[model samples]
Target: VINTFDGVADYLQTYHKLPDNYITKSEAQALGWVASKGNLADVAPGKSIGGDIFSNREGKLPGKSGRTWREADINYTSGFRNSDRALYSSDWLIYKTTDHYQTFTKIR
Candidate 1:
């Protein structure tokens, strides 16, 4: 995961449009990636960690009626083995929708 963070940070430093000198772009991007990865563990059966990751903003709302969203739902089962060789089956559910709540024709 540490390597993943560094990779993401480097990617962001070169790709993300950030203010010059406002932040150490590498460090900032790394922190953001770590925070997002950490959030995955807090997910519950009916909810996801990514849903409340940010506060409401002028152009970014925090619900299905917004432009961004996340949903994690169990739809299938497949057996997989961990390092210990123990087989496990996982399930998921969908519970996120962040788009304008209006007539269907308005969606893009």
Candidate 2:
């Protein structure tokens, strides 16, 4: 991974699995993350956003009756998040986006 957003995709591209850097929101919150303050470095440093439920409410992506989707932030350069993320499904449906959930491109 080159530390680029594409590199993020490259990192997770390994063996078709989630990258090591991503953690769930509660996991980050356990480390004392305040969404308003963005104070993640105080407890968990260098961790990206993740582990939150993603409901395809707008019918934006493909869907199955029983599958659940999870998402992780990517390319976080500073304390604040930019919304670039990697979203994946229970069955390994992967999507990447530079825009904050506005659009996505299937990665695998």
Candidate 3:
């Protein structure tokens, strides 16, 4: 249910974790959810795709040894995933991107 930008950001900042409804990409895939097709709900009714490691290959996010990043879909409601997303780190840094990964805006 935590799909809004502020909702997800507040959840992460307070709980330091993703909501229980979140499922890793691999887990969703195992359930027949295809990333390319945005078929998460078709396979897992109320689950949202999340908890997948996000490699900051472009160095857009702050990096350090041992700092790991994970991603989740934001503002997602139905078929065809949009470019909006949320990227968070093990150290509790949260960021939001509306134009896919082309740019990022810190959330917390």
Give the per-residue lDDT of model 3 (tens digit) for 4-47: 88898889878888898888878878889877887777888877
Off by over 4 Å in 2: 1-17
Task: Please give me the total number of clashing residue pairs in predicted model 2.
Answer: 1
* Pairs of residues clashing in candidate 3: none
Per-residue C-alpha lDDT of model 2 across residues 1-37, encoded as one tens digit per residue: 2334556555555655556666788888877888788
What TM-score do all the candidates reach, one by one? 0.17, 0.77, 0.91
TM-score of 1: 0.17
What stretches of model 3 exceed 4 Å from their correct place? none
TM-score, model 2 to reference: 0.77
Enumerate residue pairs that collide in model 2: 24-51
Q: What is the C-alpha lDDT of each candidate?
A: 0.23, 0.71, 0.87
Best by TM-score: 3
> How well is each residue in 2-108 modelled by candidate 1, as lDDT tens digits?
11223323433454321122222233344442333433222211121111122224423223443343211111111221111100111111122222311111111
Give the root-mean-square deviation of each candidate in angstroms. Answer: 18.4, 2.5, 1.3
Candidates ranked, most accurate by lDDT first:
3, 2, 1
The Cα error of candidate 2 at residue 53, in Å, is: 2.1
Q: What is the lDDT of residue 89 in candidate 1?
A: 11
